[PDB]
Ligand binder design. Structure first.
Ligand SMILES: O=S([O-])[O-]
Ligand SMILES: O=S([O-])[O-]
Lengths: 321, 321
């Protein structure tokens, strides 16, 4: 008698969505993911103050104006959590670039390369890292550049529209994190339907559509559903390549013993009604704009993560100067 | 003396409509049309002669249906524009298909085609303002049209300060910052459902833009557009131009309350702000910081595209079996 979590692993690679690395091992995941918000929350926990202190000391030691010291400390902090996480898992860890760079391709490429150098400085090879980038047109092209010119593997996040998914596939990025929960959020707030059956959940439908397109046309980019509101959405996506889940929902799955069966499959994808398209910049911007939810959620997701960066740098600034 | 006549002493009045048979009633200087107003006008019995002419025009040019329908809709836009000019002493704004909002080159070309059609109808480009969505691409399209072809543009769907700055640096002839749709967003997204004139978020937006423009000496004409009540309009007295619907113009004519200008070049000199420059990436970032603007620009584009599609359908149904 296996838990829903153990069954899910038979059809999908499980990933833990958190910076709270002490809570990861209980769920024995393959990979783990962090983001500006998760790092901010973890950096505020007593259990991880030594990391914050080490980040602060690193920035101070290198010296320079506040801007320089803060950049060194916050990037070092992101890397320290990443390194501790890698010690708890056999796979990769995702680390996100400051969201304030989302519309600056060259800055994201540089920041991504910088994070990789810091990991190396910490004794971690790039093969165990996934750099997360906002899926704006600039972010996707940054990903294509990182992959093709530097062998730096990326995780394209805040992916809501089909246009973003297509752009990422064409970019040849290592992995994508199409959101589920925030899509449900939008529909509940912007439509008369406040509740859905698992397979009818708009976020579930989005990942399903993206998964089928990718598998049908043979794109190698890994599909990892992300952001969940309930276990129903997660179960409805079993069969998906990867799924990153919060410790809370992972706990629910570990306690649940009902039977699970995959809803997604490569074979079912090959017979789907997907139609291959190609998007240059202007085609992408138009198609993305046709998806109101995606426009608003990508935009808000960027503002929120930037706010988490600002808040984290403030917390550091008040302890460094 | 009516509020309308008082307003004219501080601001140049513009009529927002395609219903030219009565567009000289409030003696406006300029006139503005958009995909929605043309669609509405084209369905009016009084203007069927123009529609039939547009239809006959597209057919004579030949080519596939898609080409005849395009030449017909463009001919129609120009036909209305030409009729409006016979009734007013100023300019008339004609908008480019919103479906081209992210295609700089296509907007430039379509604008040149419209100017060519006007020339055929015996209208010089001096009587014309080509309306373009204020996306980065639309703004650069306006810049190219002004500098390379001497074609004057009216940048519309302008919601954020970032768009305003971008238009100013592009040196476009005129901008149409919105007021009413900004109120709409705040009413729907905040707890405050009513605002006194100077507190109206749409009024504040145009005020910020006007003061910035006049303070730093930009020549771009500021024309407040989109109004929900006369309170917003009066609160912007002093603005270079104001385009108002025939309905609200009637209300101003019937209103006999005393009006005082709220905006002036002199006062703008002491307004609080620093001059900034925006390259593409800086623009995209600053624009994204304005949630209301991101959402309204995006939706405004979808809405006008929907109007173009509905107008094309109406024509195809009358041009082909
Ligand atoms: O990413 S949170 O919205 O699930
Ligand atoms: O443009 S209409 O929403 O005032």
């Amino acid at each position: 008698m296996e838990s829903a979590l153990d069954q899910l692993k038979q059809f999908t690679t499980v990933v833990a969505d958190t910076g709270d690395f002490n809570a990861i091992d209980e769920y024995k995941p393959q990979d783990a993911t962090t983001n500006p918000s998760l790092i901010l929350a973890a950096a505020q926990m007593p259990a991880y103050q030594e990391l914050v202190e080490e980040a602060i000391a690193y920035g101070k030691k290198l010296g320079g104006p506040q801007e320089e010291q803060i950049k060194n400390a916050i990037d070092k902090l992101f890397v320290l959590f990443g390194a501790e996480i890698l010690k708890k898992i056999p796979g990769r860890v995702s680390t996100e670039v400051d969201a304030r760079l989302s519309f600056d391709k060259d800055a994201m490429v540089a920041r991504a390369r910088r994070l990789i150098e810091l990991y190396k400085e910490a004794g971690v090879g790039k093969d165990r890292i996934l750099i997360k980038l906002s899926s704006t047109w600039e972010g996707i092209q940054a990903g294509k550049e990182l992959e093709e010119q530097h062998g730096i593997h990326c995780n394209m996040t805040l992916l809501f529209s089909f246009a973003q998914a297509v752009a990422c596939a064409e970019a040849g990025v290592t992995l994508i994190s199409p959101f589920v929960g925030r899509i449900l959020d939008w529909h509940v707030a912007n439509t008369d339907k406040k509740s859905y059956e698992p397979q009818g959940d708009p976020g579930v439908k989005s990942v399903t559509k993206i998964y089928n397109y990718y598998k049908k046309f043979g794109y190698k980019t890994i599909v990892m559903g992300a952001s969940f509101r309930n276990t129903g959405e997660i179960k409805a996506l079993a069969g998906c390549d990867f799924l990153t889940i919060s410790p809370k929902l992972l706990g629910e799955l570990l306690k649940d013993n009902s039977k699970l069966a995959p809803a997604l499959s490569v074979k079912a994808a090959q017979t789907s009604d997907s139609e291959k398209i190609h998007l240059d910049e202007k085609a992408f911007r138009w198609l993305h704009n046709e998806d109101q939810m995606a426009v608003e959620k990508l935009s808000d997701g960027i503002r929120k993560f930037a706010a988490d960066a600002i808040k984290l740098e403030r917390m550091l600034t008040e302890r460094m100067f």
